[PDB]
Protein backbone atom coordinates (compact mmCIF):
# COMPACT_ATOMS: atom_id res chain seq x y z
CA UNK A 1 0.00 0.00 0.00
CA UNK A 2 1.10 3.58 -0.68
CA UNK A 3 -0.68 5.25 2.24
CA UNK A 4 -0.52 9.06 2.33
CA UNK A 5 -0.27 10.91 5.65
CA UNK A 6 -0.07 14.50 6.88
CA UNK A 7 2.15 14.64 9.96
CA UNK A 8 5.09 16.52 11.44
CA UNK A 9 8.07 15.05 9.59
CA UNK A 10 11.68 16.00 9.00
CA UNK A 11 11.74 17.58 5.52
CA UNK A 12 13.73 15.62 2.96
CA UNK A 13 17.04 17.16 1.87
CA UNK A 14 16.70 19.69 4.68
CA UNK A 15 19.45 21.29 6.76
CA UNK A 16 20.87 19.37 9.73
CA UNK A 17 23.43 20.89 12.10
CA UNK A 18 26.07 18.19 12.59
CA UNK A 19 28.01 18.69 15.83
CA UNK A 20 31.09 17.30 17.56
CA UNK A 21 32.29 16.59 21.11
CA UNK A 22 35.51 17.68 22.83
CA UNK A 23 30.01 23.68 25.37
CA UNK A 24 26.58 22.09 24.81
CA UNK A 25 24.72 24.71 22.75
CA UNK A 26 21.04 25.20 23.59
CA UNK A 27 19.32 23.93 20.45
CA UNK A 28 15.75 25.27 20.21
CA UNK A 29 12.88 22.77 20.38
CA UNK A 30 10.08 23.82 18.02
CA UNK A 31 7.84 21.27 16.29
CA UNK A 32 10.11 18.57 17.69
CA UNK A 33 13.74 17.71 16.99
CA UNK A 34 15.25 14.80 15.06
CA UNK A 35 18.41 13.47 16.70
CA UNK A 36 21.05 11.00 15.53
CA UNK A 37 24.47 9.84 16.69
CA UNK A 38 27.21 7.53 15.40
CA UNK A 39 29.69 6.16 17.93
CA UNK A 40 32.22 3.38 18.42
CA UNK A 41 31.00 2.07 21.78
CA UNK A 42 29.42 5.00 23.66
CA UNK A 43 29.93 8.72 24.21
CA UNK A 44 26.32 9.70 25.03
CA UNK A 45 24.28 9.24 28.21
CA UNK A 46 21.28 11.56 28.36
CA UNK A 47 19.32 14.56 27.15
CA UNK A 48 17.58 17.53 28.77
CA UNK A 49 14.54 19.44 27.50
CA UNK A 50 12.18 22.15 28.72
CA UNK A 51 12.40 25.88 29.41
CA UNK A 52 15.03 27.71 31.52
CA UNK A 53 16.30 24.30 32.67
CA UNK A 54 15.79 24.90 36.39
CA UNK A 55 13.60 23.88 39.34
CA UNK A 56 10.88 26.29 38.21
CA UNK A 57 9.13 24.56 35.29
CA UNK A 58 8.77 20.82 34.77
CA UNK A 59 11.45 19.49 32.43
CA UNK A 60 12.68 16.13 31.14
CA UNK A 61 15.88 14.10 31.42
CA UNK A 62 16.25 10.88 29.44
CA UNK A 63 19.57 9.58 30.79
CA UNK A 64 20.35 5.87 30.51
CA UNK A 65 22.80 3.41 32.08
CA UNK A 66 24.47 0.09 31.32
CA UNK A 67 21.35 -2.05 31.85
CA UNK A 68 18.25 0.18 31.74
CA UNK A 69 17.05 3.77 31.38
CA UNK A 70 16.60 6.53 33.97
CA UNK A 71 14.12 8.75 32.12
CA UNK A 72 12.21 11.02 34.49
CA UNK A 73 9.92 14.01 33.93
CA UNK A 74 11.32 15.99 36.85
CA UNK A 75 11.98 19.59 37.85
CA UNK A 76 15.65 19.06 38.71
CA UNK A 77 17.36 22.10 40.18
CA UNK A 78 20.66 22.40 38.27
CA UNK A 79 23.72 20.37 37.33
CA UNK A 80 25.67 22.48 34.79
CA UNK A 81 27.68 19.37 33.92
CA UNK A 82 25.67 12.02 39.92
CA UNK A 83 23.98 14.73 37.86
CA UNK A 84 20.54 15.50 39.26
CA UNK A 85 20.10 17.38 42.52
CA UNK A 86 16.39 17.88 43.29
CA UNK A 87 13.53 15.35 43.25
CA UNK A 88 10.98 17.12 45.45
CA UNK A 89 8.20 18.22 43.07
CA UNK A 90 9.08 15.53 40.53
CA UNK A 91 7.13 12.46 39.43
CA UNK A 92 7.02 10.07 36.45
CA UNK A 93 10.04 7.85 36.99
CA UNK A 94 10.23 5.27 34.21
CA UNK A 95 12.61 2.33 33.77
CA UNK A 96 12.70 -0.09 30.82
CA UNK A 97 15.20 -1.65 28.42
CA UNK A 98 18.18 0.62 27.62
CA UNK A 99 18.10 2.87 24.58
CA UNK A 100 21.53 1.80 23.29
CA UNK A 101 21.99 -1.28 21.13
CA UNK A 102 25.74 -1.93 20.90
CA UNK A 103 27.18 -4.67 18.69
CA UNK A 104 30.46 -5.38 16.91
CA UNK A 105 31.75 -8.00 14.50
CA UNK A 106 34.92 -8.67 16.51
CA UNK A 107 36.09 -5.16 15.58
CA UNK A 108 35.38 -1.56 16.48
CA UNK A 109 34.82 -0.55 12.86
CA UNK A 110 31.15 -1.56 13.17
CA UNK A 111 30.17 1.96 14.22
CA UNK A 112 26.54 1.80 15.34
CA UNK A 113 24.19 4.56 14.21
CA UNK A 114 21.18 5.52 16.33
CA UNK A 115 18.18 7.58 15.26
CA UNK A 116 15.73 9.33 17.59
CA UNK A 117 12.94 11.71 16.52
CA UNK A 118 10.82 13.58 19.08
CA UNK A 119 7.57 15.52 19.26
CA UNK A 120 5.14 16.55 22.00
CA UNK A 121 1.86 17.27 20.21
CA UNK A 122 -0.86 17.14 22.89
CA UNK A 123 1.87 15.87 25.19
CA UNK A 124 2.71 12.23 24.47
CA UNK A 125 6.47 12.42 23.98
CA UNK A 126 7.48 10.00 21.23
CA UNK A 127 10.81 8.24 20.71
CA UNK A 128 11.25 6.36 17.42
CA UNK A 129 14.46 4.38 17.06
CA UNK A 130 16.32 2.07 14.69
CA UNK A 131 19.90 0.88 15.23
CA UNK A 132 22.22 -0.25 12.44
CA UNK A 133 26.03 -0.53 12.39
CA UNK A 134 25.96 1.26 9.02
CA UNK A 135 28.99 2.01 6.80
CA UNK A 136 29.90 4.64 9.38
CA UNK A 137 31.22 7.44 7.16
CA UNK A 138 28.58 9.99 8.18
CA UNK A 139 24.84 10.74 7.94
CA UNK A 140 24.05 8.24 5.15
CA UNK A 141 21.68 8.37 2.18
CA UNK A 142 19.97 4.98 2.03
CA UNK A 143 16.44 5.05 3.39
CA UNK A 144 15.50 3.35 6.65
CA UNK A 145 12.24 2.99 8.56
CA UNK A 146 12.04 4.26 12.14
CA UNK A 147 10.34 1.99 14.69
CA UNK A 148 8.86 3.46 17.89
CA UNK A 149 10.33 2.40 21.24
CA UNK A 150 8.31 4.24 23.90
CA UNK A 151 5.20 6.41 24.06
CA UNK A 152 4.71 8.40 27.26
CA UNK A 153 2.00 11.04 27.80
CA UNK A 154 4.10 13.70 29.53
CA UNK A 155 1.57 16.53 29.43
CA UNK A 156 4.09 19.32 30.10
CA UNK A 157 5.59 22.29 28.24
CA UNK A 158 8.89 21.93 26.35
CA UNK A 159 10.79 24.57 24.38
CA UNK A 160 14.57 23.84 24.37
CA UNK A 161 16.99 20.95 23.88
CA UNK A 162 20.41 20.15 25.37
CA UNK A 163 22.34 16.94 25.99
CA UNK A 164 24.53 15.28 28.62
CA UNK A 165 27.88 13.58 27.96
CA UNK A 166 30.04 10.74 29.30
CA UNK A 167 33.43 10.23 30.96
CA UNK A 168 36.81 9.22 29.55
CA UNK A 169 40.42 8.88 30.65
CA UNK A 170 31.03 12.54 14.89
CA UNK A 171 27.57 12.53 16.47
CA UNK A 172 24.82 14.91 17.63
CA UNK A 173 22.97 15.16 14.32
CA UNK A 174 20.06 17.58 14.81
CA UNK A 175 17.09 18.12 12.51
CA UNK A 176 13.87 20.11 12.61
CA UNK A 177 10.50 18.78 11.48
CA UNK A 178 7.88 20.80 9.60
CA UNK A 179 4.18 20.20 8.92
CA UNK A 180 4.29 18.24 5.66
CA UNK A 181 2.34 15.59 3.78
CA UNK A 182 4.22 12.32 3.23
CA UNK A 183 3.73 9.17 1.17
CA UNK A 184 5.06 5.84 2.43
CA UNK A 185 5.74 2.62 0.52
CA UNK A 186 4.82 -0.44 2.60
CA UNK A 187 6.60 -3.71 1.83
CA UNK A 188 4.80 -7.04 1.70
CA UNK A 189 6.41 -7.69 5.10
CA UNK A 190 5.03 -4.36 6.37
CA UNK A 191 8.32 -2.45 6.40
CA UNK A 192 8.74 1.01 4.87
CA UNK A 193 11.20 0.52 2.01
CA UNK A 194 10.74 4.02 0.56
CA UNK A 195 9.04 7.35 1.22
CA UNK A 196 8.57 10.55 -0.77
CA UNK A 197 7.84 14.11 0.34
CA UNK A 198 4.95 16.06 -1.19
CA UNK A 199 6.22 19.66 -0.97
CA UNK A 200 9.91 19.48 -1.98
CA UNK A 201 10.14 18.78 -5.73
CA UNK A 202 7.44 19.04 -8.43
CA UNK A 203 8.07 15.38 -9.30
CA UNK A 204 7.51 14.48 -5.65
CA UNK A 205 4.32 16.56 -5.59
CA UNK A 206 2.84 14.84 -8.64
CA UNK A 207 3.92 11.44 -7.29
CA UNK A 208 2.01 12.37 -4.12
CA UNK A 209 -1.09 13.47 -6.06
CA UNK A 210 -1.41 10.03 -7.77
CA UNK A 211 -0.15 8.03 -4.70
CA UNK A 212 2.45 6.06 -6.71
CA UNK A 213 6.20 5.74 -7.22
CA UNK A 214 6.12 5.71 -11.04
CA UNK A 215 4.85 8.58 -13.21
CA UNK A 216 4.20 8.10 -16.92
CA UNK A 217 4.97 10.72 -19.55
CA UNK A 218 2.38 13.48 -19.44
CA UNK A 219 1.09 16.57 -17.67
CA UNK A 220 -0.57 16.33 -14.25
CA UNK A 221 -2.55 19.00 -12.41
CA UNK A 222 -1.14 18.81 -8.88
CA UNK A 223 -2.44 21.83 -6.97
CA UNK A 224 -2.87 25.61 -7.24
CA UNK A 225 -0.44 28.41 -6.42
CA UNK A 226 -1.31 31.61 -4.56
CA UNK A 227 0.68 34.68 -3.56
CA UNK A 228 0.26 34.97 0.19
CA UNK A 229 -0.40 38.57 1.28
CA UNK A 230 2.65 40.46 2.50
CA UNK A 231 0.87 42.69 5.01
CA UNK A 232 -2.64 42.74 6.49
CA UNK A 233 -4.15 46.23 6.48
CA UNK A 234 -7.17 47.00 8.66
CA UNK A 235 -9.05 50.23 7.96
CA UNK A 236 -11.99 51.69 9.89
CA UNK A 237 -13.90 54.99 9.66
CA UNK A 238 -11.51 57.94 10.10
CA UNK A 239 -12.43 58.45 13.81
CA UNK A 240 -15.66 58.47 15.85
CA UNK A 241 -16.91 59.92 19.19
CA UNK A 242 -15.10 60.35 22.57
CA UNK A 243 -16.48 59.80 26.06
CA UNK A 244 -15.97 62.62 28.59
CA UNK A 245 -13.26 60.65 30.38
CA UNK A 246 -11.09 63.78 30.38
CA UNK A 247 -14.05 65.88 31.56
CA UNK A 248 -14.74 63.46 34.43
CA UNK A 249 -11.06 63.06 35.42
CA UNK A 250 -10.30 66.80 35.10
CA UNK A 251 -13.07 68.51 37.08
CA UNK A 252 -12.49 70.90 40.00
CA UNK A 253 -15.00 69.82 42.69
CA UNK A 254 -14.96 66.01 42.66
CA UNK A 255 -17.66 65.26 45.23
CA UNK A 256 -16.46 63.31 48.26
CA UNK A 257 -17.75 60.02 49.66
CA UNK A 258 -21.08 61.40 50.90
CA UNK A 259 -22.07 62.26 47.30
CA UNK A 260 -20.78 59.46 45.10
CA UNK A 261 -21.14 61.72 42.03
CA UNK A 262 -21.54 59.13 39.29
CA UNK A 263 -21.29 59.85 35.57
CA UNK A 264 -23.16 57.14 33.68
CA UNK A 265 -21.46 55.98 30.48
CA UNK A 266 -23.38 55.13 27.31
CA UNK A 267 -22.96 55.51 23.53
CA UNK A 268 -19.28 56.25 24.20
CA UNK A 269 -15.95 54.88 23.00
CA UNK A 270 -13.85 53.08 25.62
CA UNK A 271 -10.55 54.79 24.85
CA UNK A 272 -8.39 53.65 27.77
CA UNK A 273 -5.13 55.23 26.58
CA UNK A 274 -6.04 58.30 28.65
CA UNK A 275 -6.62 55.91 31.58
CA UNK A 276 -2.98 54.82 31.19
CA UNK A 277 -1.07 58.02 30.42
CA UNK A 278 -3.09 60.17 32.83
CA UNK A 279 -1.46 60.78 36.25
CA UNK A 280 1.38 58.80 37.88
CA UNK A 281 -1.33 56.78 39.71
CA UNK A 282 -1.13 55.16 43.15
CA UNK A 283 -3.66 52.28 43.06
CA UNK A 284 -4.58 50.52 39.80
CA UNK A 285 -6.21 47.36 41.12
CA UNK A 286 -8.46 45.44 38.72
CA UNK A 287 -10.59 42.53 39.93
CA UNK A 288 -13.22 41.41 37.42
CA UNK A 289 -11.81 42.90 34.21
CA UNK A 290 -8.21 42.84 33.03
CA UNK A 291 -6.58 46.31 32.87
CA UNK A 292 -5.05 45.56 29.45
CA UNK A 293 -7.40 42.99 27.84
CA UNK A 294 -10.38 45.31 28.21
CA UNK A 295 -10.38 47.56 25.12
CA UNK A 296 -11.56 44.46 23.22
CA UNK A 297 -14.70 44.24 25.41
CA UNK A 298 -17.92 46.09 24.59
CA UNK A 299 -20.23 47.09 27.45
CA UNK A 300 -23.80 48.35 27.64
CA UNK A 301 -23.29 50.87 30.47
CA UNK A 302 -20.36 51.86 32.67
CA UNK A 303 -20.51 53.61 36.05
CA UNK A 304 -17.67 55.83 37.28
CA UNK A 305 -17.89 57.27 40.81
CA UNK A 306 -15.44 60.09 41.59
CA UNK A 307 -14.40 60.22 45.26
CA UNK A 308 -11.88 62.08 47.43
CA UNK A 309 -10.35 60.13 50.33
CA UNK A 310 -7.05 59.62 52.14
CA UNK A 311 -4.27 57.08 51.60
CA UNK A 312 -5.57 54.51 54.07
CA UNK A 313 -9.08 54.74 52.61
CA UNK A 314 -7.62 54.30 49.11
CA UNK A 315 -6.48 50.80 50.06
CA UNK A 316 -9.63 50.38 52.17
CA UNK A 317 -11.81 50.62 49.05
CA UNK A 318 -11.93 46.93 48.10
CA UNK A 319 -14.49 44.09 48.00
CA UNK A 320 -15.37 42.55 51.35
CA UNK A 321 -13.79 45.24 53.52
CA UNK A 322 -14.75 47.04 56.73
CA UNK A 323 -13.88 50.43 58.17
CA UNK A 324 -15.05 54.02 58.36
CA UNK A 325 -15.38 54.28 54.56
CA UNK A 326 -16.13 50.69 53.45
CA UNK A 327 -19.26 50.16 55.59
CA UNK A 328 -20.75 53.56 56.53
CA UNK A 329 -20.29 55.75 53.43
CA UNK A 330 -19.61 53.59 50.34
CA UNK A 331 -19.69 49.79 50.30
CA UNK A 332 -18.01 47.88 47.48
CA UNK A 333 -20.02 44.79 46.43
CA UNK A 334 -18.35 41.40 46.76
CA UNK A 335 -19.30 40.45 43.18
CA UNK A 336 -17.98 43.75 41.79
CA UNK A 337 -16.21 43.43 38.43
CA UNK A 338 -14.20 46.48 37.41
CA UNK A 339 -11.17 48.63 38.14
CA UNK A 340 -10.18 51.31 40.64
CA UNK A 341 -8.16 54.48 40.01
CA UNK A 342 -6.30 56.42 42.70
CA UNK A 343 -3.97 59.33 41.92
Amino acid sequence: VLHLTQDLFLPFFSNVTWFHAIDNPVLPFNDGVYFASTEKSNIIRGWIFGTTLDSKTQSLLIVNNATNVFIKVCEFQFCNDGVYSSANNCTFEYVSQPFLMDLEGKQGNFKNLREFVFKNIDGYFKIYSKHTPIIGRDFPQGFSALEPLVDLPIGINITRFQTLLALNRADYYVGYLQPRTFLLKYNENGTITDAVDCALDPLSETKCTLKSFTVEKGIYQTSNFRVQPTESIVRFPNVTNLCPFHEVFNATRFASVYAWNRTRISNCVADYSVLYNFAPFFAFKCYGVSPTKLNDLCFTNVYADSFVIKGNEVSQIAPGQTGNIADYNYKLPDDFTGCVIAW
Binding site: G218, F225, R226, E231
Partner: protein
Protein backbone atom coordinates in the same frame (compact mmCIF):
# COMPACT_ATOMS: atom_id res chain seq x y z
CA UNK B 1 -0.23 49.44 0.43
CA UNK B 2 -1.59 49.49 -3.12
CA UNK B 3 -0.51 47.26 -6.02
CA UNK B 4 0.36 44.48 -3.56
CA UNK B 5 -1.47 41.47 -2.14
CA UNK B 6 -2.70 42.27 1.36
CA UNK B 7 -5.49 41.15 3.69
CA UNK B 8 -8.14 43.83 4.20
CA UNK B 9 -10.86 44.27 6.82
CA UNK B 10 -12.54 47.45 5.56
CA UNK B 11 -15.20 48.55 8.11
CA UNK B 12 -16.29 44.94 8.64
CA UNK B 13 -15.70 43.73 5.06
CA UNK B 14 -12.92 41.14 5.23
CA UNK B 15 -11.05 39.62 2.32
CA UNK B 16 -7.77 39.30 0.45
CA UNK B 17 -6.41 40.68 -2.79
CA UNK B 18 -4.76 43.67 -4.43
CA UNK B 19 -5.92 47.30 -4.38
CA UNK B 20 -5.12 50.41 -6.41
CA UNK B 21 -6.58 53.76 -7.43
CA UNK B 22 -9.80 53.62 -9.45
CA UNK B 23 -11.77 55.99 -11.67
CA UNK B 24 -15.14 54.77 -10.37
CA UNK B 25 -18.20 57.00 -10.12
CA UNK B 26 -19.14 55.97 -6.58
CA UNK B 27 -22.08 58.01 -5.33
CA UNK B 28 -21.44 59.87 -2.05
CA UNK B 29 -23.70 57.51 -0.10
CA UNK B 30 -22.10 54.41 -1.63
CA UNK B 31 -19.72 52.50 0.64
CA UNK B 32 -19.34 48.99 -0.83
CA UNK B 33 -18.90 47.75 -4.38
CA UNK B 34 -19.76 44.59 -6.26
CA UNK B 35 -20.32 43.18 -9.75
CA UNK B 36 -22.87 41.14 -11.71
CA UNK B 37 -22.29 37.99 -9.64
CA UNK B 38 -22.30 39.69 -6.20
CA UNK B 39 -18.55 39.51 -5.56
CA UNK B 40 -16.90 42.44 -3.79
CA UNK B 41 -14.83 44.48 -6.26
CA UNK B 42 -14.56 48.05 -4.94
CA UNK B 43 -14.39 49.52 -1.43
CA UNK B 44 -14.46 53.19 -0.50
CA UNK B 45 -11.66 54.23 1.82
CA UNK B 46 -13.16 55.01 5.26
CA UNK B 47 -10.25 57.37 6.06
CA UNK B 48 -9.56 58.93 2.64
CA UNK B 49 -12.97 58.73 0.87
CA UNK B 50 -11.17 57.29 -2.16
CA UNK B 51 -12.21 54.27 -4.23
CA UNK B 52 -10.02 51.16 -4.48
CA UNK B 53 -10.54 48.09 -6.65
CA UNK B 54 -10.33 44.51 -5.41
CA UNK B 55 -8.33 41.77 -7.12
CA UNK B 56 -7.90 38.02 -6.77
CA UNK B 57 -4.69 37.31 -4.89
CA UNK B 58 -2.68 35.53 -7.58
CA UNK B 59 -5.02 32.74 -8.67
CA UNK B 60 -3.59 30.24 -11.11
CA UNK B 61 -2.66 26.57 -10.96
CA UNK B 62 0.49 24.45 -11.02
CA UNK B 63 0.81 21.58 -13.49
CA UNK B 64 3.95 19.43 -13.66
CA UNK B 65 5.04 18.18 -17.09
CA UNK B 66 7.34 15.17 -16.83
CA UNK B 67 8.43 12.25 -19.00
CA UNK B 68 8.55 8.72 -17.66
CA UNK B 69 10.22 8.48 -14.26
CA UNK B 70 12.42 5.67 -15.60
CA UNK B 71 13.60 8.11 -18.30
CA UNK B 72 14.68 11.07 -16.14
CA UNK B 73 13.84 12.96 -12.96
CA UNK B 74 13.84 16.32 -14.76
CA UNK B 75 10.52 18.16 -14.52
CA UNK B 76 9.09 21.50 -15.64
CA UNK B 77 6.45 23.59 -13.89
CA UNK B 78 3.46 25.23 -15.59
CA UNK B 79 1.49 28.06 -13.98
CA UNK B 80 -1.80 28.56 -15.82
CA UNK B 81 -2.96 32.02 -16.84
CA UNK B 82 -0.70 34.38 -14.88
CA UNK B 83 1.96 36.73 -16.20
CA UNK B 84 5.40 35.34 -15.74
CA UNK B 85 7.14 38.50 -14.60
CA UNK B 86 4.41 38.46 -11.94
CA UNK B 87 5.25 34.93 -10.84
CA UNK B 88 8.99 35.76 -10.98
CA UNK B 89 8.59 38.77 -8.69
CA UNK B 90 6.39 36.63 -6.43
CA UNK B 91 9.23 34.11 -6.19
CA UNK B 92 11.75 36.90 -5.55
CA UNK B 93 9.58 38.27 -2.74
CA UNK B 94 9.04 34.68 -1.52
CA UNK B 95 5.27 35.01 -1.05
CA UNK B 96 4.10 32.22 -3.37
CA UNK B 97 2.22 29.48 -1.53
CA UNK B 98 4.29 26.70 -3.18
CA UNK B 99 7.44 25.91 -1.23
CA UNK B 100 9.10 23.80 -3.93
CA UNK B 101 11.19 26.00 -6.23
CA UNK B 102 12.43 25.18 -9.73
CA UNK B 103 15.56 27.06 -10.76
CA UNK B 104 15.15 30.19 -12.90
CA UNK B 105 18.32 30.39 -15.00
CA UNK B 106 16.84 33.02 -17.34
CA UNK B 107 16.82 30.57 -20.24
CA UNK B 108 14.05 28.42 -18.70
CA UNK B 109 11.26 31.01 -18.85
CA UNK B 110 8.56 31.00 -21.53
CA UNK B 111 5.61 33.39 -21.22
CA UNK B 112 2.98 31.29 -22.99
CA UNK B 113 -0.68 32.09 -23.64
CA UNK B 114 -1.44 29.33 -21.08
CA UNK B 115 0.90 30.80 -18.46
CA UNK B 116 4.66 30.76 -18.48
CA UNK B 117 6.62 27.51 -18.47
CA UNK B 118 9.56 27.24 -16.06
CA UNK B 119 12.03 24.37 -16.22
CA UNK B 120 11.86 24.10 -20.02
CA UNK B 121 13.56 26.05 -22.80
CA UNK B 122 11.98 27.29 -26.01
CA UNK B 123 13.30 25.84 -29.27
CA UNK B 124 12.21 27.52 -32.49
CA UNK B 125 12.17 24.17 -34.31
CA UNK B 126 8.82 22.40 -34.66
CA UNK B 127 8.23 18.78 -33.64
CA UNK B 128 5.16 16.61 -33.22
CA UNK B 129 3.25 16.92 -29.96
CA UNK B 130 4.40 14.72 -27.09
CA UNK B 131 2.93 16.33 -23.95
CA UNK B 132 0.11 18.87 -24.52
CA UNK B 133 1.04 22.22 -22.97
CA UNK B 134 -1.75 24.30 -24.50
CA UNK B 135 -1.89 27.31 -26.81
CA UNK B 136 -0.12 25.39 -29.56
CA UNK B 137 2.79 24.27 -27.37
CA UNK B 138 3.99 20.77 -26.51
CA UNK B 139 6.92 19.72 -24.33
CA UNK B 140 9.11 16.66 -24.89
CA UNK B 141 12.33 15.03 -23.73
CA UNK B 142 15.00 15.36 -26.42
CA UNK B 143 18.76 15.19 -26.81
CA UNK B 144 20.83 18.37 -27.04
CA UNK B 145 22.76 16.50 -23.10
CA UNK B 146 19.14 15.65 -22.25
CA UNK B 147 16.53 18.14 -21.08
CA UNK B 148 12.87 19.13 -21.47
CA UNK B 149 12.16 21.39 -24.44
CA UNK B 150 8.96 23.31 -25.20
CA UNK B 151 8.06 24.02 -28.81
CA UNK B 152 5.19 25.03 -31.04
CA UNK B 153 3.14 22.36 -32.78
CA UNK B 154 4.47 20.76 -35.93
CA UNK B 155 1.19 20.64 -37.85
CA UNK B 156 2.79 18.17 -40.25
CA UNK B 157 5.09 17.92 -43.23
CA UNK B 158 4.69 21.08 -45.29
CA UNK B 159 3.63 19.94 -48.77
CA UNK B 160 2.86 21.85 -51.96
CA UNK B 161 0.76 20.31 -54.72
CA UNK B 162 1.38 20.81 -58.44
CA UNK B 163 -2.15 21.75 -59.48
CA UNK B 164 -2.42 23.04 -63.05
CA UNK B 165 -4.90 23.44 -65.88
CA UNK B 166 -3.92 20.14 -67.54
CA UNK B 167 -1.84 18.20 -64.98
CA UNK B 168 -2.98 14.89 -63.47
CA UNK B 169 -1.19 12.44 -61.18
CA UNK B 170 -2.33 8.83 -61.60
CA UNK B 171 -1.11 6.03 -59.29
CA UNK B 172 0.82 3.52 -61.39
CA UNK B 173 1.09 1.23 -58.35
CA UNK B 174 -0.69 0.52 -55.08
CA UNK B 175 -0.09 -0.70 -51.54
CA UNK B 176 -2.27 -2.66 -49.11
CA UNK B 177 -2.30 -1.29 -45.56
CA UNK B 178 -4.01 -3.20 -42.76
CA UNK B 179 -4.88 -0.49 -40.25
CA UNK B 180 -6.20 -1.26 -36.78
CA UNK B 181 -9.19 0.36 -35.08
CA UNK B 182 -10.16 -0.24 -31.45
Amino acid sequence: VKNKCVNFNFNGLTGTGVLTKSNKKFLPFQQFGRDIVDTTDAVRDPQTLEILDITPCSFGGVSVITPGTNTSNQVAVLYQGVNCTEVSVAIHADQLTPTWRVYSTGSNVFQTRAGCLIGAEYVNNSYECDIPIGAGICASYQTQSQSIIAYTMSLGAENSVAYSNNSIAIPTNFTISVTTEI
